[PDB]
Amino acid sequence: MREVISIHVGQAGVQIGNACWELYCLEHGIQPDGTMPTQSTNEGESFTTFFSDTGSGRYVPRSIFVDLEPTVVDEIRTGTYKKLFHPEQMITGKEDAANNYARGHYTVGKELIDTVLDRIRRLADNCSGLQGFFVFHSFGGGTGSGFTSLLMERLSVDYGKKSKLEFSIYPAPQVSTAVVEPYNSILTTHTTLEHSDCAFMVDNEAIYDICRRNLDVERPSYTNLNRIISQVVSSITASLRFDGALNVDLNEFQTNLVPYPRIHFPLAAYTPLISAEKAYHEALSVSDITNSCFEPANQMVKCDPRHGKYMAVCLLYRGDVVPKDVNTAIAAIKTKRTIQFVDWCPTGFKVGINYQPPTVVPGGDLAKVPRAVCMLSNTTAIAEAWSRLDYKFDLMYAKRAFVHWYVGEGMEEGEFTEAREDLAALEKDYEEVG
Amino acid sequence: MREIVHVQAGQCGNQIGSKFWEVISDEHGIQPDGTFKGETDLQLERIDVYYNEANNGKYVPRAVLVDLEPGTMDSVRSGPFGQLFRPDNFVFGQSGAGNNWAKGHYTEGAELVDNVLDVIRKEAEGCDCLQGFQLTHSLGGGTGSGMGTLLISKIREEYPDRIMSSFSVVPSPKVSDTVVEPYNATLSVHQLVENTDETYCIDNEALYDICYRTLKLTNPTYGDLNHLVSLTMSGVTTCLRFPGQLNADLRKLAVNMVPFPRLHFFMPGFAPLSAKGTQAYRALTVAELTQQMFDAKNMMAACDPRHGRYLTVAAMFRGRMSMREVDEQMLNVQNKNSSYFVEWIPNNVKTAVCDIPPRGLKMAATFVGNSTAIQELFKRISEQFTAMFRRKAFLHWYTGEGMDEMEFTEAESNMNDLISEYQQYQ
Amino acid sequence: MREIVHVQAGQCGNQIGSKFWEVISDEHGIQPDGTFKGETDLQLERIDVYYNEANNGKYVPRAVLVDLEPGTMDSVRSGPFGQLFRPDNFVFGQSGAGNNWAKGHYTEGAELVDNVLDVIRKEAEGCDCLQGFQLTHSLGGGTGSGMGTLLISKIREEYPDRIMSSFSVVPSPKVSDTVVEPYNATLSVHQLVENTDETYCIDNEALYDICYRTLKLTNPTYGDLNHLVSLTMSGVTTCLRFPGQLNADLRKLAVNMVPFPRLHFFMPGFAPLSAKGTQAYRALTVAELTQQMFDAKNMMAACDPRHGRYLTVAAMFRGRMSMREVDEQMLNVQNKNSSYFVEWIPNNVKTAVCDIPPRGLKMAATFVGNSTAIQELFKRISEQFTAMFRRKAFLHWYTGEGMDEMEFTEAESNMNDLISEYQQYQ
Numbered sequence A: 001m002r003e004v005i006s007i008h009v010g011q012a013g014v015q016i017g018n019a020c021w022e023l024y025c026l027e028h029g030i031q032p033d034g035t036m037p038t039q040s041t042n043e044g045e046s047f048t049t050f051f052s053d054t055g056s057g058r059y060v061p062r063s064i065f066v067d068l069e070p071t072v073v074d075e076i077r078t079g080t081y082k083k084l085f086h087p088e089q090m091i092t093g094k095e096d097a098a099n100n101y102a103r104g105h106y107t108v109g110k111e112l113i114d115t116v117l118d119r120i121r122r123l124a125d126n127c128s129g130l131q132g133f134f135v136f137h138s139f140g141g142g143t144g145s146g147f148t149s150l151l152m153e154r155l156s157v158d159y160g161k162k163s164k165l166e167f168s169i170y171p172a173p174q175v176s177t178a179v180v181e182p183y184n185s186i187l188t189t190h191t192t193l194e195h196s197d198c199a200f201m202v203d204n205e206a207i208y209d210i211c212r213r214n215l216d217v218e219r220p221s222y223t224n225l226n227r228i229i230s231q232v233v234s235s236i237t238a239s240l241r242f243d244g245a246l247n248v249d250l251n252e253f254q255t256n257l258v259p260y261p262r263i264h265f266p267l268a269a270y271t272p273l274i275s276a277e278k279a280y281h282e283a284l285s286v287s288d289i290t291n292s293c294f295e296p297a298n299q300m301v302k303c304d305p306r307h308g309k310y311m312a313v314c315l316l317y318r319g320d321v322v323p324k325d326v327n328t329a330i331a332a333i334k335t336k337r338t339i340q341f342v343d344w345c346p347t348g349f350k351v352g353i354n355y356q357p358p359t360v361v362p363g364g365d366l367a368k369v370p371r372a373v374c375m376l377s378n379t380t381a382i383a384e385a386w387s388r389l390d391y392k393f394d395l396m397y398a399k400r401a402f403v404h405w406y407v408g409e410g411m412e413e414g415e416f417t418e419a420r421e422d423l424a425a426l427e428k429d430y431e432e433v434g
Numbered sequence B, C: 001m002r003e004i005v006h007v008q009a010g011q012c013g014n015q016i017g018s019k020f021w022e023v024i025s026d027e028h029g030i031q032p033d034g035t036f037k038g039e040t041d042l043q044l045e046r047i048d049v050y051y052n053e054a055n056n057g058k059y060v061p062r063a064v065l066v067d068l069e070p071g072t073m074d075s076v077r078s079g080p081f082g083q084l085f086r087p088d089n090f091v092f093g094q095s096g097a098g099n100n101w102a103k104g105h106y107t108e109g110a111e112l113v114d115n116v117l118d119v120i121r122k123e124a125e126g127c128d129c130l131q132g133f134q135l136t137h138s139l140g141g142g143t144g145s146g147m148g149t150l151l152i153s154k155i156r157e158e159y160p161d162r163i164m165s166s167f168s169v170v171p172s173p174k175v176s177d178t179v180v181e182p183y184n185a186t187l188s189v190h191q192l193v194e195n196t197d198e199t200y201c202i203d204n205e206a207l208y209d210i211c212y213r214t215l216k217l218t219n220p221t222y223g224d225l226n227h228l229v230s231l232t233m234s235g236v237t238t239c240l241r242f243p244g245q246l247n248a249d250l251r252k253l254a255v256n257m258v259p260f261p262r263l264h265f266f267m268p269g270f271a272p273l274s275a276k277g278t279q280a281y282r283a284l285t286v287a288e289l290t291q292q293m294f295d296a297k298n299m300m301a302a303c304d305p306r307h308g309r310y311l312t313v314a315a316m317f318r319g320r321m322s323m324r325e326v327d328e329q330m331l332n333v334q335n336k337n338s339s340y341f342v343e344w345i346p347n348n349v350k351t352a353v354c355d356i357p358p359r360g361l362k363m364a365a366t367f368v369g370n371s372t373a374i375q376e377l378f379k380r381i382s383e384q385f386t387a388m389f390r391r392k393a394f395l396h397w398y399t400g401e402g403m404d405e406m407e408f409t410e411a412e413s414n415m416n417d418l419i420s421e422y423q424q425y426q
């Protein structure tokens, strides 16, 4: 049937995948050792998109772990989730690229790219309904940028027509770690425009704002930030892993949300995202959280949504939701005038309601709420998020700082110049279409 | 004898019939095994029209179930009345349209059209003389509006003689359902005005307004919205399945209404409609059931009936009724509402009365009207269709499939000539 | 046949009928389910005048219940005989008048007037020939005196032919009930002298004086004060509902009394009225029931009957009575009280006798009189109305709604011409 493959490249690929595949074992009733208990067969209704069958219910994830460094991969090969994954699906590196492009685009990647594309083809030949790709990466990583652009340069030659999905983290304009992240974000945007269907972005700080105010988590780290992103990942798959009245597959997401083949970069949002106590004193209706979707304390990228112009807003609901107030509240959004559209698209809405409510992680900070919304809103606030990063790249480039690492690794300096004219017209097209 | 197949394509029309066959099962006294348990043989003497009995009475519905994915197959199969359908007909693909017309028409629908074409042929070879087809699909989505669009273009090569019922949902002015919803409308109706005989433009929006006021139901289940679509369709074919003082087949419903080979775009109506507690407090007279039929409340589409003119009034009444009171009040509406009719067509009322009511009432009324305010249905979508063609958005999902730009404009000219023809006689 | 709707608006008239329909229910032998349990068909042969039977005999009263808030809805609905009323008619708003005329007339009443206007239309379309309307509301408050005021201004556009019964309570000279009570009187009567046919000025004050002396009741429940309003109204329409030796409809009660198109302001009366223990100790003769009717005690309004003149005496007697003793004593009152009549109108007594008494007695008398001492009812309020206009108080609750100052003075001139017309013939 339909079967979807996931690829995890970089350390952000490692631990986000350590949460998403951890979460899916809860939502299908699969024990982490590798087999299933017999009670979760009725829950296991069309789980075939990720898990091959082996011998007696033993379910390997159709997932590939790619890293140039063996350290964080051994965390998978130490914990409980060691026996779940397949060993020859784990392909490790030895020498690190250290957030450098040609160290991750030519040096260690080209010794390992031929090993992993076989493991792509070894697994994908079982498919008769191969839909899409979950590729997880960063923007400033050596293998996060240098290998990811090269990997998407090769799978479009192989499979082409079949879809792709990229999840990543938007680098914050104020608080971020690596100094080469303004460099590599221009590099990972250069040749991945042509080789990616859609790519999503989240902020470190925009997670933190709801963590401190609504979750009331005043000591967050990369443990709980992986759980919050994984709920957004799981809510997309709920249209596919279960039987809904009006649901949507991966080819349909890009068909609605891509108005032009270059501007295809929306973001995410999730609500209700609060702690376990505040849901007790409040009855969260449909009109409650849907109006909570379109306020700037709910976006997952810290920018100005009111200074952006909405073009195609996508909505996926979960839980037992009636469509009457849905057909009212989205109309009640249209009664408000602050939600600005473009003049040519009034019909940029998507309706999706699944029967299954989201189930929370065990021992987590969330609360069991029936209603939830995964808001996807492509807008022109991405252009205002382009200018904050195009300011960082050029001024460090003008003094030619940190160029002496990019030179000797098999890389040219004129490629920095061509990406400048490439990204200049990109943020222009938000204002040209808008 | 007079035999009709029912074909479902796209996610909309696949679940409409899934509640609709149940009433057809229950009006004739059969079981999910197809076991006849009707007490009177009035439920058996016209059982053959939608069924092919084989090998000790397990009646199979003359139904074809097509999808581009196996998602909607198992839900109907494991759901209610799943054992009744013939597993020979479970033909499907592995793509999914992704709300794309040229995928459903040129790319992916062109593969699966050959398999069910023989299935259309196979059940039509085992009968003496076919009568017409009934088709449930969508016009907003991509599967039924792309694949069921092309199916009518090949029925006329097999059977250029009979009638074609193409029941499909239509967009609403208030809230759009999909993003390419004006694209899926103009390109479909381009083929619907070529080779079809009737479409019933049912708005998703106004069905809640029926349920919110009459039924007062706070929780609209999608089984219940199609249930009001289910009782509409069963009242249309009551003459072919039941006797009475005046019988009227689908061709008589066709020939009385459509005046010109394009204007066949009709909206349906049904009375009585109310909640539970208002049963005894109103009257079950001919007069009370009359004025409900001619209200904006009973308009299943969200168009205003006092912004148009009724051309052909079809009154399919169900139940033991007095003919003269039907003859009384159908005169009386034109003595009241002569502005609400077209003027140059005299005697706008067509009346067909079967003496059998549906299960659950004592006297019912199945209305199908022709208001020229349905011109505004194609006014509102022709602007939304030309809202995005002026900026050439989403062209890489159609030209990337291989669609012509003139395929838009040829449909766009024929869309605008359509509202000129309602304007011709209004 | 001859059909009459009963409409209630404002908190006063909503609870008057709530005990009044009970007697109408009990005089004709029906139940809160509407189940007819009358033993003799005399209680059935004119049941149609206030009812529309539908679907196995659950009679619904031809009643419309309007409020600006849902407060008075549920109390009537959950109270006694709550299951009898049709839930189609439960039309209401969400404002509350707050004792403001221009809210009830211009601001908030203008919204809810459209919904029940079709409800006035709907029950009048299902009949052959309407007869007239009866309306219970207030003149002191804000809801009924503001919204029911405007309703009569739109009945004449629908039906400029029939009669209009506008029963409403009036202010008393002793203790005012609300603060803007002279404002709610002059502005209402400005519209009441334009398009109405009868008003019964019932004082809230003198109803206790009836209960304190005759009934001797120490605890006046508001169910009991409207109970004396209930038996007054049922005796008026006894001819249309029961046979007898002389029948007299509401139009005959109209045409005999009103001499000029303004002077139709009548006070009612009822006899016998006493407590429990004085039953056997008095006499049930024509002579004892006569002189009770012409006492200041029986004056339901607090005006002095020997400070005016009876113009038209309406004697609606109920019970098996001797006609000659009625013919005897109605002569004898004018041989006693010739000063108490107008002089130039001969034979001031109008007599209508139905041979059916109300339930609970053996012989009763329903009196409606026309004293010209009701001139003092509009003398006392025209000074209180002009008590606060001289200081322009509370103008920011009316001009803030958008009321004209000339709207006061145009009503104020027509208020003072009204008492000149009682002065014309006194």
Ligand SMILES: Nc1nc2c(ncn2[C@@H]2O[C@H](COP(=O)(O)OP(=O)(O)OP(=O)(O)O)[C@@H](O)[C@H]2O)c(=O)[nH]1
Binding pocket: A009, A010, A011, A012, A013, A015, A016, A068, A069, A096, A097, A098, A099, A100, A104, A138, A139, A140, A141, A142, A143, A144, A145, A169, A177, A178, A181, A222, A225
């Ligand atoms: N929040 C979060 N961010 C991560 C995590 N892992 C990596 N990142 C992001 O990845 C960016 C840089 O990429 P890295 O993961 O450090 O390097 P890489 O992708 O493994 O590529 P190499 O240099 O070849 O090792 C940083 O800016 C981080 O924000 C993680 O576990 N949690």
Ligand SMILES: Nc1nc2c(ncn2[C@@H]2O[C@H](COP(=O)(O)OP(=O)(O)O)[C@@H](O)[C@H]2O)c(=O)[nH]1
Binding pocket: A245, A246, B009, B010, B011, B012, B013, B015, B097, B098, B099, B137, B138, B139, B140, B141, B142, B143, B144, B145, B169, B177, B204, B222, B225, B226
């Ligand atoms: N009433 C009702 N309408 C539905 C249901 N499912 C889909 N629809 C309608 O069908 C339209 C979408 O068409 P669909 O067949 O689902 O897309 P497709 O599969 O690509 O052809 C929408 O406008 C929905 O309103 C349902 O269960 N009930």
Ligand SMILES: Nc1nc2c(ncn2[C@@H]2O[C@H](COP(=O)(O)OP(=O)(O)O)[C@@H](O)[C@H]2O)c(=O)[nH]1
Binding pocket: C010, C011, C012, C013, C015, C097, C099, C138, C139, C140, C141, C142, C143, C144, C145, C169, C177, C204, C222, C223, C225, C226
């Ligand atoms: N007998 C009786 N009179 C009432 C009752 N309720 C209100 N009234 C009279 O109604 C008058 C007030 O009018 P009302 O309708 O309450 O004010 P509104 O709602 O603003 O129109 C007062 O003079 C009261 O005497 C009741 O239950 N019984």
